[PDB]
């Protein structure tokens, strides 16, 4: 399951949506667009924990972020936006304070986003998929989805 959040220039979440049924179960019930960045990330993880989808027994989470580079002004400020974006999720992570849980962050450009749109899949998942192709391992979206993120990382 993957969860996609939309934020504004003010680093404020405006729209929250789940791409998967499991994702909707955890994403649903979250009312706080103003502070969904850190709060939703930590609450969602707990929701998954309660549902049983995620187990504290060694769990890796991959988070991908993308900014609009179409604007020159945005590109320059992009470095500042990226640093703040990482910091906001960092706080959520600090909230969890779970040693067994390790986070990972990556950057996504418009090129990857366009590809994600074509495949109607989350850009974050696309990133992992890209690595799989490089490895040459026969990996598919459904198979990876059925497998845990931690399991995918460790091969």
């Amino acid at each position: 399951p993957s969860v996609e959040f939309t934020i504004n220039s003010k680093h404020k979440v405006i729209v929250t949506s789940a791409i998967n049924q499991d994702a909707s179960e955890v994403l649903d019930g979250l009312e706080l667009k103003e502070k969904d960045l850190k709060s939703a990330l930590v609450m969602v993880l707990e929701k998954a924990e309660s549902l049983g989808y995620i187990s504290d027994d060694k769990n890796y989470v991959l988070v991908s972020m993308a900014l609009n580079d179409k604007n020159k002004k945005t590109r320059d400020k992009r470095e500042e936006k990226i640093d703040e974006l990482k910091e906001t999720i960092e706080q959520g992570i600090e909230a969890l304070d779970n040693d067994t849980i390790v986070h990972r962050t990556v950057t996504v450009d418009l090129e990857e986003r366009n590809k994600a749109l074509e495949n109607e899949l989350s850009m974050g998942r696309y990133y992992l998929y890209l690595e799989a192709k490089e490895k040459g391992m026969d990996i598919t979206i459904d198979e990876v989805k059925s497998s845990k993120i931690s399991d995918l990382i460790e091969k």
Partner: peptide, 12 residues
């Protein structure tokens, strides 16, 4: 254009 930026999270 309305959405300035967006982020995605992959978790199983």
């Amino acid at each position: 254009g309305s959405e300035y930026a967006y982020v995605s999270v992959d978790v199983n």
